[PDB]
Amino acid sequence: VDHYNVAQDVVQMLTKYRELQDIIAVLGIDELSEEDKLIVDRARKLVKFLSQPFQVAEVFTGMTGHYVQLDDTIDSFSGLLMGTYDQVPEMAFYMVGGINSVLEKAKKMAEEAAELEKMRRAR
């Protein structure tokens, strides 16, 4: 039942995202209400989060692949829908596998940007 509910919610959010993409194409992004903005952000994360690195492409693309277990998939998408991961950057979901990958890539992004600040602050 949880799997079915999560799948339907994702489909509903994606459909709403397409509708919101049409309004911003006319009214503008600033015209969306507070709820619509949150829906857009969550949907964009979902779209970025649906991409996976295949182990078969390790040689060509270099990046190590991921095999996401079903239990992880339901929990990872369920948490995103509720809004638990509303503070993670959008790009942390692009071509990553599982929720844990989203977090480690956030560490590597937060720590990476930390050096950039000490550089840009200095110099």
């Binding site: 503070q87 977090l103 480690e104 937060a110």
Partner: peptide, 30 residues
């Protein structure tokens, strides 16, 4: 008022999520 009177895998994700966001606040500070 009476209510006030009376009073592991998921932990790793909460730990990482908290710690992940910890550096995100620190970078903003300095």
């Amino acid at each position: 008022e009476a209510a006030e009177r009376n009073p592991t895998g998921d932990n790793a994700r909460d730990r990482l999520l908290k710690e992940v966001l910890a550096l995100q606040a620190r970078i903003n500070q300095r």
